[PDB]
Amino acid sequence: GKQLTILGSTGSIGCSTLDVVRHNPEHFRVVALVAGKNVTRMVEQCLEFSPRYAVMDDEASAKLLKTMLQQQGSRTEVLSGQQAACDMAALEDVDQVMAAIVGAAGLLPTLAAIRAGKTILLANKESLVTCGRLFMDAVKQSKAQLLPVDSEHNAIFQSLPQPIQHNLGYADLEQNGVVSILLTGSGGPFRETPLRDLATMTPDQACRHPNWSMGRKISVDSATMMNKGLEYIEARWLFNASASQMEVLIHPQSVIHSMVRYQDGSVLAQLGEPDMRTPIAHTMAWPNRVNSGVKPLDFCKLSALTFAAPDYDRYPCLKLAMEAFEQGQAATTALNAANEITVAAFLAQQIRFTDIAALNLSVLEKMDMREPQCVDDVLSVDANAREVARKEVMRLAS
Amino acid sequence: GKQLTILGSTGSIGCSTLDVVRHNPEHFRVVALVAGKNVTRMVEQCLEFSPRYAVMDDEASAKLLKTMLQQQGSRTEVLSGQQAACDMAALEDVDQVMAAIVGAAGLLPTLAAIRAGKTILLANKESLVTCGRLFMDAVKQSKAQLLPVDSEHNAIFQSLPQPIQHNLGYADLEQNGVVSILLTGSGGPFRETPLRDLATMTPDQACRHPNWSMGRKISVDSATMMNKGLEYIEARWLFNASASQMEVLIHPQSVIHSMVRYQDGSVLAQLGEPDMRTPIAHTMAWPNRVNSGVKPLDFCKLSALTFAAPDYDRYPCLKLAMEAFEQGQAATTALNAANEITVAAFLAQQIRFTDIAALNLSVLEKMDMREPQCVDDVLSVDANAREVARKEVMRLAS
Numbered sequence A, B: 001g002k003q004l005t006i007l008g009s010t011g012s013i014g015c016s017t018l019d020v021v022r023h024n025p026e027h028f029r030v031v032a033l034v035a036g037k038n039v040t041r042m043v044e045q046c047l048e049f050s051p052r053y054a055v056m057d058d059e060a061s062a063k064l065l066k067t068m069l070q071q072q073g074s075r076t077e078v079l080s081g082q083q084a085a086c087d088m089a090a091l092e093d094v095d096q097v098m099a100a101i102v103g104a105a106g107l108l109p110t111l112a113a114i115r116a117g118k119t120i121l122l123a124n125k126e127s128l129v130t131c132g133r134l135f136m137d138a139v140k141q142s143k144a145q146l147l148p149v150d151s152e153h154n155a156i157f158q159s160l161p162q163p164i165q166h167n168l169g170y171a172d173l174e175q176n177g178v179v180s181i182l183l184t185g186s187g188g189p190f191r192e193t194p195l196r197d198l199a200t201m202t203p204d205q206a207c208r209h210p211n212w213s214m215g216r217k218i219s220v221d222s223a224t225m226m227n228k229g230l231e232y233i234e235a236r237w238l239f240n241a242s243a244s245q246m247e248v249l250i251h252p253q254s255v256i257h258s259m260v261r262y263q264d265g266s267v268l269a270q271l272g273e274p275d276m277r278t279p280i281a282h283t284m285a286w287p288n289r290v291n292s293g294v295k296p297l298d299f300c301k302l303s304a305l306t307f308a309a310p311d312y313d314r315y316p317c318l319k320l321a322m323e324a325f326e327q328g329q330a331a332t333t334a335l336n337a338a339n340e341i342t343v344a345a346f347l348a349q350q351i352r353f354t355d356i357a358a359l360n361l362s363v364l365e366k367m368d369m370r371e372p373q374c375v376d377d378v379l380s381v382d383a384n385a386r387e388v389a390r391k392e393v394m395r396l397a398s
Ligand SMILES: O=P(O)(O)C(Nc1nccc2ccccc12)P(=O)(O)O
Pocket: A149, A150, A151, A152, A212, A214, A218, A222, A227, A273, A274, A275, A276
């Protein structure tokens, strides 16, 4: 049985992760759960998985949770605050750490797990976007095994040779017969929309994800392909890949999750249903496999699979992300920050769908900052990009 | 780097193999080339790769080769006969033996390489189709390493976890998280043809292989799907798969070469150009990669990829193969034998296209002998199934 702490257990990934342990109680044991303010869900989780510790990121939620657990008879030790989260992510006992706390708050805890040499199930994919360097450096200096939970990166992981799977992040791609990494995306809902109409697209239209359903912010990112841009940035750090070793390909059906091209012409791909339990279960069980609860993909009920090259005039955000990577970590975290503001602004109906890319570009032009040397520096860049982003939204909205 | 013997060097696979060698001088050294009667090519190959030995089918063909090699200044030593052919596959200083001699011949030579514990580049279907059990028991005894060269089997191997690859046939699919092997095939030229018309199809119509060109006998095998049936038989032996661990899908475009599904929902696949140098280069460099000279496939220049389940009314040969497996090596050897006679008879316009499956089934029901104990036994079953089959064809010509 492997012991693990789930960073961000009340969220979607967290629940999908707990579902997987539910399918394999003999294989996994939850030692600790860490969450934010969703006390009700945290209570059910503690009552069902009996963790040694339950941590909230707030004293008000911790006491509120502590009262309910005691009322229910649970003796799970309650804690509060980011420091506690970091302690859970470094417990001598635990083997794996499901890093699913999104945003800045996930940085330090995830870093703690890495330093503690734990096996990290990286769901907090945005932490490579901002601390790619720091994180990969720390990963190598501790030999902590990184296992990407993101569907695209996981697909690539599974399609990569074993020597790279181990030593992930500092292994030599070319030396292992790998030509390039093929990152796939659906192209969003506006794949075939006339460029002329992109400026008038509405939040509800942009939120109609082509295949499966998901959050509004991440849906918009899928429509601008910024998600693919952020994933591009992450992949470069994660698989130690150069610009010429990366390819982006639109694949509307999203049956293939991503691929890897090899020296001899071979292309290895991972395919499957749109259910996060699959990549999650893959990482939790690696190098082996376990039942995930996901139905077997039925090839006889699929839409014909197609592919196409990404048109940059249609996806300026995708080009913007690629260009930013070559500029530095300051640029990528700034791009991420800005996109956070502009998308929320678009959803709030303050700016046009097309204003997302332009404003995003605009913020990077104004930044002009030095590459961070630590997390605290990253937070600094992030914060400055958000205010600049907010000024432009207000400047454009007024 | 690697010393190798090439069984059937003058054929298609053999040449593709030398091209990979020509592409990687520093990695492979040709120790021995074995062929039939094509002295012309054996000369150029011997001149270009300076093997130590070369053997031809008969003394005449060899006598002539020896003269030209001497006259051309070549130092290679000439031999002839099956025993010399087998001796080359067992040379102490040989690492890999590309087993590309097809049919009843090449059986003993590939068994020779297995018995010598070498790494076998299996590009000979006859082996597993007629001696599946004898051979897998043999490779298990000598610890020989089988690397499948055939496109479908190679794709499956590439999509299988490392523990299975290093222990082919001997490994356990379920313990390693594999739920099943997905064998793909184009479905042939008659994939869409009305069932009633199959009886009138001509050799020429049967020989229009859907995606790329190939032999007439093989094109026909693709039209009847006997092609996939034989591969189905091999796959079960090669990867130790049960009936329920096998799936046969029709994939018209042949971009996906085959796949394997895992317990967590993941499906790994191998894609590429229809060039044999890819799978050959793969087995030669395994566990690493080498240049094959094959153009990387362009995902933007493909036709929509589709799938469909094979209808046994349309492809009775497929089902026949599946049934023969349950009956043992005598049944599979008999099916293979009968099929060579009926296909050839079809090509000669002696029987109808639909007479192929009909007569294959029929000779199978007339066959007695069951479960051979050695190669000579299968050879005997082969010889008898051919005679029964020839009479079938001759009786039908009345
Ligand atoms: O895991 P990712 O990469 O964040 C996500 N990709 C996803 N790919 C396949 C299936 C999914 C099912 C549910 C949620 C996300 C999914 P996206 O690229 O943001 O759409």
